[PDB]
Amino acid sequence: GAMTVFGSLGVSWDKLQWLAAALSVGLSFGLQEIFGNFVSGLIILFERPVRIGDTVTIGSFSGTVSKIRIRATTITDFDRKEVIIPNKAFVTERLINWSLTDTTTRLVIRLGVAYGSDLEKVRKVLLKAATEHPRVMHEPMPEVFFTAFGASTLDHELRLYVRELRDRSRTVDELNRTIDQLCRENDINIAFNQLEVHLHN
Amino acid sequence: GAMTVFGSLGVSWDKLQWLAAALSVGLSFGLQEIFGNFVSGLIILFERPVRIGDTVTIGSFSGTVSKIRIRATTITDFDRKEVIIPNKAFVTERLINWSLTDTTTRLVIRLGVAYGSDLEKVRKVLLKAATEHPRVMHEPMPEVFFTAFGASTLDHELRLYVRELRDRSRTVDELNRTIDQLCRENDINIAFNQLEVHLHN
């Protein structure tokens, strides 16, 4: 209606078309964030860097991608808190996916040992607990590492492997239970924080 | 279809081509993030700043680069959490690579000693433990440094060298085990946190 009113009285389309074009660019630089999203979605769909069913972490948002679209991707979190992520972050921003070519993952079990202990006994107990599990992988050998002279307790890390991304927590539960039972049986001290006080009067 | 309908009724291509060009730039500034990625990938491929098989750290993401492409680079993390990084961060953003010209690295072993100890004895024990290893390099001499008058314990650092980037942790394990054994043998006190309390009533 405004265009018709202006044309029927002023008729200056050939006069304000340049202003229209300048305003058009100055105000259509608002669609960059949308067209980039669309192009990123198309690129993701064509290249297939992530597939449906794997675990993806981006921006401290780890979860299983459920549906992929041309505008936004839906990731079901571990609490079914559906996260909607623009595909521009999927294309032009770095991400992590845990199931790409080998669907295997290593996990660490950290513990502290008292200063007056037996490092060889602790290593044997940890290795036996890791090996006795009927699920941990054997081709990559699980190892125990002495990695830190802690302020109160020496730090020990057991880096061991799981080939299934689903049960990454039940294995940790069983391993920790077995480690605690073996430590209690073999009398390995897991000391608390320690300090020395000098007192007078 | 819309173009044909507009042309067959209005025929104003020569009238809205300027608006088309303005919108084209305003909405094709959405491909900057993609073309920069492509050009960065091409530049990385030509210049070869990083090769396949070395260890690269960028944005707190350290791992071994597996495949390099024109759009995104794949880095297998230490947990096989495949990180997909746009090559724009590889070209226009700083990074670190541990295997460029000499594939060697120095590592530090930190420990604390009690105030009432023998600094010369501690230095001798640390140097003997560092030297007795059959892997640490000898051309750069390993040294022990007294670097901090700590609040509770004096801080000692052993900076020693490894020429292989693969076994950077097993050497640390063996060195720490040997250091602990030698300290226990020679009676060197690794004190905990200490404080003094004044009490009354």
Residue numbers in the entry:
A (entry chain A), B (entry chain B): 897 to 1097
From the manuscript:
Amongst these family members, MscK is unique in that channel activation, in addition to elevated lateral membrane tension, requires the presence of certain external ions such as K+, Rb+, or Cs+ 32–34. To better understand the biophysical underpinnings of mechanotransduction and to establish the molecular basis of dual activation in a ligand- and force-gated channel, we have determined cryo-EM structures of EcMscK in distinct functional states by leveraging GOF mutants.
To potentially improve structural homogeneity and to achieve a functionally distinct conformation, we decided to characterize a GOF mutant G924S, which, in contrast to the WT channel, was active under elevated membrane tension in both KCl and NaCl conditions. Thus, the cryo-EM datasets of G924S in NaCl and in KCl were essentially indistinguishable, which allowed us to combine the datasets to further improve the reconstructions of both the closed and open conformations to overall resolutions of 3.84 and 3.47 Å, respectively. The final atomic models fit well into their respective densities and were refined to good stereochemistry. Akin to EcMscS and AtMSL1, the pore-lining helix (TM11) in the resting state is kinked, and several bulky hydrophobic side chains point to the central pore axis to create narrow constrictions. A hydrophobic gate near the cytoplasm is constituted by V921 and F925, which are conserved amongst MscK homologs. The arrangement of the eleven TM helices generates a midplane bending angle of ~30°. The periplasmic gating ring is primarily held together by packing interactions of inter-subunit three-helix bundles, in which one of the interfacial helices engages its entirety at the interface in the closed conformation.
